Chain A
Amino acid sequence: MLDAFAKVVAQADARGEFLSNTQIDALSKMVKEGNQRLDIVNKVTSNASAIVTNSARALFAEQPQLIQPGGNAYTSRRMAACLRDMEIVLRYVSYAMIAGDSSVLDDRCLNGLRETYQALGTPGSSVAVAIQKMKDASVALANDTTGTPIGDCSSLVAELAGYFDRAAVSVV
C-alpha cells in the first residue's frame, strides 16, 4: 500500500525527476490540514460500533425481507457475517482517510468483493444501501464540533464521502 505522500513520489520516480517547488508547496498544505484529518479519523473510530449497528437496524426496517426465512440475513451465522462485512468496509474507509489515498481500500478490501457476492448470491443492491447509511452517519459526525476548535473542514468531508461512494460502486 502507499499513502498520498508516497503517491506523488511513485509518480515522480517513474519519470526520473526530482519533485518540483510547486509540488513541495502542495505537500505543505497536506501537512497543514494535519490535525483536522486526525479529528475525522478519531470521530469515526470512536463511534464505530454504533455506526455499524444502528445502520444495520435501519436497513432491516426498510428492507425487512432480508431477515425473513429465505432471506440473505436469516440465521445467526448469516446475520453475524453481515455485521462483520459492514465493519470491514468501515475499517478500510478509515484506513483510506488517514492515508489520503484509496489504495489500501481497494487492494485489501474491494478487489474481489463483487466476485465474492456473485458466487454467494448476496444482494449487491442491499449492500450499497448499508454502505450509504454508514456514509451519512459519518459525514454528519465529521462536521459537528464536540470538543474541536471551530473551523472549515468542508474539503476533508468531501474526501471522506468519496471513499464511501467508491466502496459502494465496487459492489453494486
Chain B
Amino acid sequence: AAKPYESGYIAEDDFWRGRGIAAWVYATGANKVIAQIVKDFNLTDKKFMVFIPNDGAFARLSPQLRKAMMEDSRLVYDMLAGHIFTSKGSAMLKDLQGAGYLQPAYGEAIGYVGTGRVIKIGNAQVIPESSDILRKNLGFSAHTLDTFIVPKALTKKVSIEAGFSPVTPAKYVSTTKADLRYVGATKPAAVGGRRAMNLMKQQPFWMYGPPYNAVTQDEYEPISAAAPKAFVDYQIFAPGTVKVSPDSVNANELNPVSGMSKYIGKTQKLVGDQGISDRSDKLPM
C-alpha cells in the first residue's frame, strides 16, 4: 500500500517487510488472510507462535501444489492457519526441544521433533540463524522455516498425474538451404522435371566404387549424355588462343602407387564431394 519506511518500521504491518525473510506474504495477498485468521480464532489477546516460511520456501513450492493453492482459497486458509501455534504460547527455540506435539490454529495437531539446534516441525525445518524474533506488543514468537508445513491430510487431492508432469518440446533442426533442395522432390516428375531426384544426398567416396556403384545425380541429367557428332577443329584458331592446363605436373598426384587416382582412369568418380548438384537453379522444366 504505502511505503514501508514510513513510521520507521515500528508498525506491525511494515516490520515484516523490513525483516525481509517472508516477502511472499505481501507479494501475494497472504497478509490479509492471517489478519483474518486472528480475527476468526481470537488470538489477539493470548500469546502464540508463528512459523513463517521464508522466500525460497515459496520458490521451492511445487507446481502441482501452487496451482491447488490458487483454485482453492480454502486450502490457502488452513495452510496459513497451519503455521500459527497456540500450544506453548510465545515459545522460544529452547522450549521446542525433544519430541512432542503442537496445536495449530485450525488444523489437526502437528508433531515436532526438536533435537538441539536442528528442529523439525514435520516436513519443515527451522533455520535457526534468524528465528528467535519476539514482538512485545500483540505478543508472539516468529520462527523461520525452509519449507511449508504441508500436512498430508490436505494434499491427497493433489498429484502430478493431473497434468503437471513436466514435458519439454523438441523441434527439428533442419537448415534452410537443405529443405529448399527438398521441396522439388514433392512435385511429380512430369512437373518437377530435373528436380525429382533432389532427395539423394552425398554418399561417401567409396560408395561410387565398383562393388557398390552408387549412381551420381549427374546421370539423371542430360549433361551425362552430351555426345554430339559435331566437334571443334582447334586448328582454325590463331596460334596462342587454344589453352590447355594439366591438373598437376607430378607423377605421384596424377596416379599414386595404388589405383586411387583422381584424374586418370575410372577412379575419378571416387571423390568425397560431387555426388549431388545444383539443378534447382533453372526451372521446374
- Do chains A and B make direct contact within the complex (CB under 8 angstroms)? yes
Nearest A-chain residue to B216, judged by Cβ: A61
| Residues A51 and B164 in contact, CB atoms below 8 Å apart | no
Partner of B162, one of A17, A47, A138: A17
Which chain A residues lie closer than 8 Å to B179 at the CB level?
136, 139-140, 143
B174: interface (CB < 8 Å): yes
Which chain B residues lie closer than 8 Å to A133 at the CB level?
199
B259: interface (CB < 8 Å): no
A26: interface (CB < 8 Å): yes
Nearest A-chain residue to B183, judged by Cβ: A140
Nearest B-chain residue to A63, judged by Cβ: B214
| Residues A137 and B163 in contact, CB atoms below 8 Å apart | no
Which chain A residues lie closer than 8 Å to B198 at the CB level?
54, 58
Interface residues on A, range: 35 or more
Nearest A-chain residue to B213, judged by Cβ: A64
Tell me the minimal C-beta distance from B25 to chain A in angstroms.
Answer: 25
Which chain B residues lie closer than 8 Å to A63 at the CB level?
214
B200: interface (CB < 8 Å): yes
Which chain B residues lie closer than 8 Å to A139 at the CB level?
172, 174, 179
Nearest A-chain residue to B167, judged by Cβ: A26
| Residues B217 and A22 in contact, CB atoms below 8 Å apart | no
| Residues A50 and B180 in contact, CB atoms below 8 Å apart | no
A3 to B253, alpha carbons, bound, how many Å? 62
B67: interface (CB < 8 Å): yes
**Which among B179, B185, B197 has the greatest number of chain A C-beta atoms within 10 A?**
B185
Q: Which B residues have a C-beta under 8 Å from some C-beta of A?
A: 67, 71, 159, 161-164, 169-172, 174, 178-183, 185-189, 192, 196-201, 203, 207, 212-217, 219-220
Task: Taking A20-B67, A50-B196 as given, write out 9 further A-B residue pairs in contact, using a Cβ cutoff of 8 Å, ordered by the A residue number.
Answer: A47-B186, A47-B187, A60-B215, A61-B197, A136-B174, A136-B182, A137-B182, A137-B199, A140-B178
Q: Which A residues have a C-beta under 8 Å from some C-beta of B?
A: 8, 11, 15, 17, 19-23, 26, 47, 49-51, 53-55, 57-65, 133, 136-141, 143-144, 154-155, 157-158, 161-162
